[PDB]
Symmetry: D3
Subunit: 231 residues, 6 copies
C-alpha cells in the first residue's frame, strides 16, 4: 500500500519534476514508489546498465521504498492495449493513494505519451473485470497529479520543497552520465547547465508562493481543499 507511486518515461524524469516532493513525503514517513516505463536505451550518454545503477542511487538518496523497472521501448510509447496492461499490474501491486506522472506539454514526446498510457492504466486498474498479467484485484487511485520535466508552465498548485532542495540536487547529481560532461560524452540539452535551470524554475515557483523553493503540479481531477484553504 504505497502512499505515492510516481511514474516517469525514463529514470531521472521523476527526480527532475518532483524529487524535492518525494524527499519531503519520505520525511513525513509516507511510502513512495518510483516506476520507470523504459530503460532509456536510446540515451545519447551512458548505457542501460550504468543508468540502472545511477537510478538506484537517486532512489536511495530520496528514500524511495522501491524502484520498479518496466521495459516499454524508449521512443516507442505508442498507445497499445498491452502497454496499458503492463502499467495496470504496477498500479494494482503498489495500491497507491496518489499517482504522479509527467505533464504532457514538453518538448520530449515520450513525456506526454507516458502520461496518456498512465491515465488509461489508472482507469483500467479500477475495473474488476479488466484482467492484468498477475490477475490482481481492482484498485482505485484517489489523487492523480502531473509534474513538469522540460516545461516552465503556470501550475495548478505548488509544494514547498525549501527543506529538501539539497536532497533533490543530490538525486540529480547521481545521474552523472546524463548531466555531467566526460571524455566520451556528447552534447545534449541535459549536459549544458540543466540542474541549474531546474533550480531556477523551483526558485521562481517558490517566489509565487513566498518560500525559497517549490515544485509545480497539475491536477485534471477536481482538487478538494480543507486545511490548506486557511493554512
Amino acid at each position: 500500500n504505497a502512499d505515492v507511486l510516481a511514474f516517469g518515461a525514463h529514470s531521472d524524469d521523476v527526480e527532475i519534476g518532483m524529487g524535492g516532493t518525494i524527499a519531503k513525503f519520505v520525511k513525513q514517513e509516507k511510502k513512495v514508489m518510483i516506476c520507470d516505463l523504459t530503460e532509456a536505451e536510446l540515451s545519447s550518454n551512458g548505457t542501460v546498465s550504468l543508468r540502472k545503477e545511477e537510478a538506484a542511487e537517486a532512489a536511495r538518496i530520496l528514500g524511495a521504498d522501491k524502484r520498479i523497472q518496466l521495459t516499454l521501448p524508449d521512443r516507442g510509447l505508442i498507445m497499445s492495449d498491452q502497454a496499458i496492461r503492463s502499467i495496470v499490474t504496477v498500479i494494482r501491486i503498489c495500491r497507491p493513494k496518489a499517482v504522479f506522472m509527467p505533464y504532457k506539454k514538453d518538448r520530449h514526446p515520450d513525456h506526454g505519451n507516458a502520461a496518456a498510457l498512465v491515465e488509461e492504466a489508472i482507469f483500467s486498474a479500477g475495473i474488476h473485470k479488466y484482467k492484468d498479467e498477475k490477475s490482481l484485484p481492482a484498485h482505485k487511485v484517489s489523487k492523480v497529479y502531473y509534474y513538469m520535466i522540460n516545461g516552465f508552465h503556470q501550475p495548478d498548485f505548488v509544494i514547498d520543497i525549501s527543506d529538501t532542495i539539497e536532497a533533490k540536487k543530490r538525486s540529480l547529481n547521481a545521474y552523472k552520465s546524463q548531466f555531467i560532461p566526460s571524455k566520451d560524452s556528447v552534447s545534449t540539452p541535459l549536459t549544458n547547465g540543466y540542474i541549474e535551470i531546474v533550480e531556477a524554475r523551483e526558485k521562481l515557483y517558490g517566489k509565487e508562493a513566498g518560500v525559497e523553493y517549490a515544485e509545480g503540479f497539475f491536477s485534471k481531477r477536481m482538487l478538494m481543499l480543507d486545511h490548506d484553504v486557511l493554512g
Copy 2:
C-alpha cells in the same frame, strides 16, 4: 484579526456563493466577518431596512462574527479612488488572513465590478504610505479567493460542505423578500426556484469530489498545498 473577510456586492451574495463554507469555518472556531459593499437599494423585492434585518439573521444563522455595511451605490460600483479607499478601511480594520469575493463571470455586472474594487483594495491595503479614511496601518492579506453567485463554472478547487448544507439553506431562507413570492412580490430570477438551483450546483461539485455537497472557488494567487496533497 478575522481569519476570513467575505465581500459581496449585495447581502445574500456571500451566502449563495459560500454560506456552507462560512458555517464550516465558524464550527472550526475561525472568526468570519462579512462585508456588503451596497445596501441593495435597487432590489426589485423588499426595502433597504427589511433587507438589513434579513442579512443580520442570515449572519446569525451562519455564526459570522460581524456584518459590515458599506454604502456604495447598487448598480454604481464604477472603479474610483474613493470606492477603493472605503474598502481599504474595512480590510485594515478586520486584518483578515483570507479575503473572499465574487467571481467576475456572472450575468450581474455588480459582481465583477465588486471583485475589481476589492482586488485594488487588497493591494492598496498593504501599502503603508496609502492612507485610508481611519489612518490605519498596512495589512497584507495572505489568501484571496473567488466564489460563484449566478455562475456554474469549473472551479479551481472545492470545499466539502456536506455537514453545513442545512445551515446554508437556512441562511438563504432568511432572505424571504428575495427568494419567496408574496402578495406584492415581482418575478425575478431569484423568486423562481433559485435556492434549489444553488443546491443542484453544490450537489454537482460534490460529485466531482466524491462528497454530497461542495462549494467551488477560484484563486488567482498561486495555491501552495501541503496536507491536502495526500489528505
Copy 3:
C-alpha cells in the same frame, strides 16, 4: 435515411447525454438511430446479455427506430484502421443528417477514444474511394454534435428537454443493473445517486436558458443559425 445517429461507447452513454433530446426528436417525427461501439463486457455490474435487454428497453422507451450493436472492445477503443472502417459502415447504412457522440472531457477514457474514432469515420464515410466492409456509397453527414456523459462543462448550446425529462429518467431506469443496487451489485460511481446528478446538471443548464431542463452540446463545425437567432 436517419435524421439522427447517436454513438456511445457503452449502452446508457447516449441516454445519459441526450435521452431527453432523442425523445424530443422522435416526438417531432424524426428517425433516430443509436449505435453502441462496445458490448460493455467489462461493466462491474450485470452481464453482456442482460445489458443488451436493458438497452433494447431504453431504446423502445425513447422511441429510437433501431439500436446497432458493434463489438469493439470495452477499454480497447485504440485508434485503428479496422475500428474506423467498422464505424464507416454504420454511417453509410444510416445516412444520417446529424451524428452525435461523446464529448472527450470525461473521466472515462473510452468516451474520448470513441469520439476520436467517430470523427475519423465521419470524414472517411464521405470519401467515395474509401471502401467499407459492405462496399457502400459515400455519405456526407451535415451536423456533428458532442453530448456530455460524466462531465459538467459549459456547453456551446442547449436543447430544451423540459417536456421529455420523464422519458429520459424512464430510459435510464431501464438500466437497473447499472444504476440500482441489488444483492450482488458492487459499488460504482453509477450506483450512488447518479440519475439524480444527471437531473441536477439538466436543471442547471435549464436555468442558464430560462427553462426547467436542458441538455448541453458542443459543435466543432461552425453553427449556422436562422430561426433560433430571434426565436
Copy 4:
C-alpha cells in the same frame, strides 16, 4: 417593440459587422432599430453633419425602421453612471427582443468600451427601481449578440447573408467620406480597400458554413437551439 436594436460606437460600425443580417431581418418583416453612441466627431475624413446624412442613407438602404443618435464623446466612452443611463433610455424606448453590439477584441478601443457600456445598460434596463432620464418601465432583453468590426475571429455562430451581400455593400458605399478617397481625404485603414476586406471575411465565414457569404457573431448568454439543430 423593436425585434432588434443594434448599437455601434460610430455610424458604419453596425453596417460593417452585420449590415447583411439587418437587411435579412427587415426582409423577414422584423423591426430593426440602429443606435450610434457617438457622432464620430474625431473621424479623420468628413464632418459630423455629412456623416449623419450618410448614416441616414445607409439605414434607408438596409430598411432599418429608426436611427437613434446619442452624443457620447468619440474616444471618450469611459465607463460612467451617466453614460449607462443614456443607453438604458434607448433600450427602454425600443423594448428590443435582441440587442447587438461590437465584439471587444478590436484594434479600436471605442468598440470594446461601447460593448462594456451596452452590457451595463442591458442589466440596468431590467431593474424597475433603476431610473432612466425618461422614467420608463423595466425591459428585459432576451437575446444579446456581438458582431465583428475590425476583427477576423472564430465566431460562436454565423448567419447566411448570401441573399443580402449586395444590400450590405450598398450600405457601406453610402459612407463615401469614410471608404472612398477624394481630393481632400487623408489615408486611414478605412480608405485602402476596406469594403473588399469585409467581403473577404464574410466569404471565409460562408465557406465554414457551406454558403457564399455569412456574418459571424458571439453570445455570452447561453444559446438555446431548436429548429437549427437539424435545420
Copy 5:
C-alpha cells in the same frame, strides 16, 4: 542541407498553406524541399499518376529543389513506430534548418495526424541511438512551424507574400484535377471556388499586417526575435 523541408499529408497541402512563402524563400536563394507523406490514392478526383505529374509541376513553378514522395496510406496516418521511422529518414537526408507541417485544427484528420507523426520524427531524428532505415546520423532541426490548409485561425505570426501571390496561384492551378471541374469530376470542397477562398484568407492576414497578402504560421517552440522586433 536544405534550408527548409515542408511536409504535407497530400500533394497540394504545402502549396495551399505556404506556397507564397516557398516561392519567397527560393527567390532569397534558400534550398526548399517538399515531402508528401501519402500518394493521395483516395482523392475523389484524378489518379495517383496524374497527381504526381501535377505535384512535379507545382514544385517546378515554386522553384522547390526536390519533391520527396512517401507511401504512407491516405486516411491511414495512424501513429506507428514504422511510420515515424520513414519520416526520420527524410529529415536526416535533407538536414533542414526549418521544418513546416500542417496545423492540426483542420476538418481533415490526416492534417493533424501528419503533424503528430512529423513532431515524433523531428524528436527521434536528433537521437543518435535511434536508427532509421538508411542508418543516417542524428540531425537537430532548429525551427518548427505549422501552416494552415483548411483553417482560418488567428496565427502566431505572418510572412508577407505580396510579391509571390501570383506564383502561389500558379502552383495551385497546376492541380487541375483537384480544383477545376471537368466532364468526369465529382463535387468536393476543393472544386467549388477553393483557390479564391485561400486568396481571401491571405488578403485578411495581409490586412492584419499592413500588406496585400500574408500567410499565417504557428510555432510551439519559443520564437526568438532580433531584426524583426523593430524591422
Copy 6:
C-alpha cells in the same frame, strides 16, 4: 523620432521587464526613451526625490536618450480622458516606431492599469482631430509590445540579452532604496532577493531559446516576420 518608447507605472518597471533589451537596442544605435507614468510617491522605501536620482542613474547605465516623468498618481491610474491625453502628448513628442508597456497579468494592479491607459493613448495619438495638451500632430506607432514585471508567463517571443545581462543588473542595482535593505528599510517583495528572481526568469527564457539569458514579450498586434523565420 525615437526608435523605442518604453512606459512603466513606476521607475524600475522598464528595467525589470526589459533593461537587457534597452541596453541591446542602444548598442545597435537605436534611440530609446523611457517614460514613468508616476513618481512612485507611495513606495514603502525611499522618497520621490531619491527615486528620481536612482532612475536617472539607471537610464544613464542603459544609455537611454531621455527619461520622461509624468505625474499621474501612484495607485491612482484609473481610466480617465485627462490621463490618456497626458500620455498622448508623450507619444506625439517622441514619435516612436515601437512602444513597450507592462503586461497586465501581474499582482500589482498599476501595471495592468498603466497598460490600459497606454493602449488608449496609442490609438488616440494616431487620430488627427484628437487634441493633446501641446497641439501636436497625429503619430502612428508601428509596433506595440508588453514586458513582464512581477509575472513569469509563457511569452509570445523572447529577445536574447545574453550580452547585456550585466548592464541590466547594474541598472537594477541603481535602485538601492528599492532592492537593498538599509537601517531604515521595510520589508517588501522587492527587498528579499528580487534581482536574483529576475535573473532566474531570464535564465529560464534563455533555455527555451538556446541562449544564456532572454527577456519575454507579448504582442496583441499581429507579428510579421521576415529575417527571423530562418535566422
